[PDB]
Design a protein around this ligand. Structure first.
Ligand SMILES: Nc1ncnc2c1ncn2[C@@H]1O[C@H](COP(=O)(O)OP(=O)(O)OP(=O)(O)O)[C@@H](O)[C@H]1O
Ligand SMILES: Nc1ncnc2c1ncn2[C@@H]1O[C@H](COP(=O)(O)OP(=O)(O)OP(=O)(O)O)[C@@H](O)[C@H]1O
Ligand SMILES: [Mg+2]
Ligand SMILES: [Mg+2]
Ligand SMILES: [Mg+2]
Length: 674
């Protein structure tokens, strides 16, 4: 076993004893039960490398440590006694830099509610924060049962170990204090990320005991961010199908993964070093060495060069890095060092962005390939990442060709990106497994929705400063991604809100997501499903975040040959109107700019004014079209049922009741006419 695998896997598995001990498997602390576990794993199956990795749990110089490394005889794995010792000290420091066994993981949005334990990657039914229900020993026993089975089967490799730990430890508290918001998965990968970085920075056991890795700028915080996305995605003509736009959006995800995996490859890191990769905006923990810097400088130049030659200024990737000490991953309490670091890095990226300078495409050959991919997306299981002009390459990024992995075909590549599953399954043993998750929902006018989280920046930096360490930032980012890449699927598949449309058979929405990720959604479909979807999505989000974040939205309606370019800008402007309301939390309903609170649109506009008109004009002779049109144009001169007219009259005073009413009348027209 190689020293870099030793360190990265040791960092992942150093804390494996915690569910073991919470299940009561053996006896002693988690350090003791974790080592016994991995040793049982080694001896039960035959993979001796689980023995050597049991040492990392056994900590977390002493006679006993030395004697123990000697018993293990690391030479049979091709390591020296000194090697294992340096790794054990490195992981020990990585864990430092990154009370009652029944406490669950508390919610990031309210440290008063908490998740019951659940396994990921199965009917992902919005595990949201309920009241404090301590976790049973027997829950952990079922956890350890699945853990053992999947650990038994998985390659002893970061790309295969990571997804097993994510599957089962995402809703396990890392430290059972109350109010703890860091999952055990988040802590393990952060430990692994920082330990591998320390190894690549050359940190030794001497640097660790001296405290030099806490003090000195041994790490880089790398941050990348695309700009120009709206022009890259939505600048297409009338020709340009919905399929074509979905491929366009999926292509940009590939372009960002190409850069990320090139950085990990070139610097010698693991997917664990990816703090997050959300909306074409990523953060990576790396070593601060001269070599790594000049790798980064070359990757950046290449990616920027490729982007400009492929699409000129239509799409720009800004990459920056910030040297930081291990101490700057954390707060030091009244220091807020990590927050300071993030804001220097944000300022550089800001600066880097100022330096940025076909019938469908504008500029087509890449447009031909996106149509092809557009056709294939219902059966696409993922993408093989390979040499640019290898066989099967459909589209290219700055560094690689991507081969579509289809339901029939055979996966091909050195990295295989696999869609919406943590199970590597089909792929070859040699391949680097890279799971990615996307909201891939797919069913007189059509409806277009843009929803976007209000003030997302401020929450990461201050918000509700509970996220001012690297691990809490990873925990916050991940929860958010869980909403926008998975939970939004369920809302489209199993909706419950149909005030406009009828309940009748519970039916999926007539809609397709063009993109959902980071903190933004772009959705099209039948115009009333799209309205009901925006509201129901906002309410799920409101319950998911316990009201600590809000969202604003735009819903436009459009004829059929309408250019997508104009559609996107027009709804963005409606979203602008909703953002520019004080307090943001709102929605511009239709291509005008009267704007409503979320709870007032549903309860007042929809379920008070609108169905007042709808109930009392149902299948009625004298067409409500006649009545509403002239009413859209004194009160008893204008003269319905006395009780019908009078409720209308009291609404037409001067309040906000008048303007909601007009939107409600507008709704009747669009629903009923023709
Ligand atoms: N693959 C994708 N498809 C569609 N939209 C995406 C994709 N990736 C990111 N986005 C969205 O695009 C938006 C960003 O748009 P754009 O790049 O035009 O401006 P910006 O990123 O705010 O500018 P800057 O990067 O300078 O801050 C984000 O809301 C993000 O959610
Ligand atoms: N899951 C996530 N993890 C980490 N960062 C994210 C995530 N989702 C979005 N972001 C980032 O948060 C920021 C959102 O910026 P945006 O331009 O939408 O403003 P914001 O802070 O919410 O202000 P506003 O309320 O106007 O949207 C961007 O930096 C985006 O890349
Ligand atoms: Mg921009
Ligand atoms: Mg936002
Ligand atoms: Mg946004």
């Amino acid at each position: 076993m190689e020293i870099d695998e030793l360190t990265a896997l040791g960092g992942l598995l150093h804390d494996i004893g915690k569910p073991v001990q919470r299940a009561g498997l053996y006896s002693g602390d988690h350090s003791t039960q974790g080592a016994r576990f991995l040793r049982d794993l080694a001896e039960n199956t035959g993979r001796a490398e689980y023995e050597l990795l049991s040492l990392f749990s056994e900590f977390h110089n002493d006679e006993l440590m030395i004697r123990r490394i000697k018993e293990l005889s690391p030479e049979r794995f091709g390591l020296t006694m000194e090697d294992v010792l340096n790794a054990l000290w490195i992981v020990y420091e990585a864990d430092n830099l990154a009370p009652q066994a029944s406490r669950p993981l508390y919610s990031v949005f309210n440290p008063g509610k908490a998740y019951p334990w659940a396994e990921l990657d199965f009917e992902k039914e919005l595990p949201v924060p309920g009241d404090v229900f301590s976790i049973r020993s027997q829950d952990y026993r079922e956890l350890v049962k699945r853990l053992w089975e999947e650990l038994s089967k998985a390659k002893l490799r970061s790309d295969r170990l990571l997804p097993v730990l994510e599957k089962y430890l995402t809703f396990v508290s890392s430290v059972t204090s109350e109010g703890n918001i860091i999952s055990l998965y988040d802590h393990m990968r952060m430990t692994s990320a920082i330990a591998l970085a320390m190894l690549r920075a050359g940190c030794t056991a001497e640097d660790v005991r001296s405290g030099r890795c806490r003090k000195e700028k041994r790490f880089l915080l790398i941050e990348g961010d695309f700009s120009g996305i709206q022009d890259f995605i939505y600048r297409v003509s009338g020709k340009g199908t919905l399929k074509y736009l979905r491929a366009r959006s999926a292509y940009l995800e590939l372009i960002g993964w190409d850069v990320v995996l090139e950085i990990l490859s070139r610097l010698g890191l693991t997917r664990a070093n990816v703090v997050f990769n959300a909306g074409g905006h990523f953060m990576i923990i790396a070593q601060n060495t001269p070599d790594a810097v000049k790798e980064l400088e070359e990757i950046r130049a290449k990616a920027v060069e490729w982007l400009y030659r492929e699409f000129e200024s239509d799409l720009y990737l800004a990459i920056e890095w910030e040297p930081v000490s291990g101490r700057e991953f954390g707060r030091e309490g009244g220091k807020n060092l990590f927050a300071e670091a993030r804001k220097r890095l944000k300022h550089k990226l800001t600066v880097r962005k100022l330096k940025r300078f076909c019938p469908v495409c504008g500029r087509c050959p890449t447009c031909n390939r996106l149509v092809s991919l557009g056709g294939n997306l219902p059966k696409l299981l993922g993408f093989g990442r390979t040499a640019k002009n290898d066989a099967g390459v459909l589209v290219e990024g700055p560094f690689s060709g991507f081969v579509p992995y289809l339901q029939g075909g055979r996966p091909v590549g050195e990295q295989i990106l696999v869609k919406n599953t943590l199970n590597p399954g089909e792929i070859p043993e040699s391949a680097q497994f890279v799971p990615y998750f996307v909201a891939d929902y797919f069913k007189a006018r059509l409806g277009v929705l843009r929803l976007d989280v209000d003030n997302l920046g401020q929450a990461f930096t201050h918000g509700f400063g509970k996220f001012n360490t690297i691990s809490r930032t990873a925990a916050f980012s991940r929860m958010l991604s869980l909403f926008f890449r998975q939970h939004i699927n369920y809302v489209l598949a199993r909706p419950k809100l149909r005030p406009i449309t009828g309940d009748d058979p519970a039916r999926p929405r007539e809609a397709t997501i063009i993109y959902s990720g980071g903190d933004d959604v772009f959705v099209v479909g039948a115009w009333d499903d799209v309205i009901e979807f925006g509201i129901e999505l906002r309410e799920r989000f409101h319950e998911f975040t316990q009201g600590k974040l809000t969202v604003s939205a735009g819903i436009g309606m459009f004829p059929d040959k309408y250019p997508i370019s104009v559609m996107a800008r027009e709804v963005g402007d409606l979203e602008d109107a909703a953002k520019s309301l004080p307090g943001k939390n709102g929605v511009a309903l239709f291509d005008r700019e009267f704007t409503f609170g979320w709870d007032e649109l549903l309860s007042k506009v929809i379920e008070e004014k609108y169905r007042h008109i709808a109930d009392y004009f149902s299948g009625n002779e004298e067409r409500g079209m006649a009545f509403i049109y002239k009413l859209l144009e004194w009160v008893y001169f204008l003269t319905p049922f006395q009780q019908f007219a009078n409720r209308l009259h009291q609404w037409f005073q001067d309040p906000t009741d008048a303007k909601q009413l007009k939107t409600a009348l507008h709704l009747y027209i669009y629903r009923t006419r023709k």
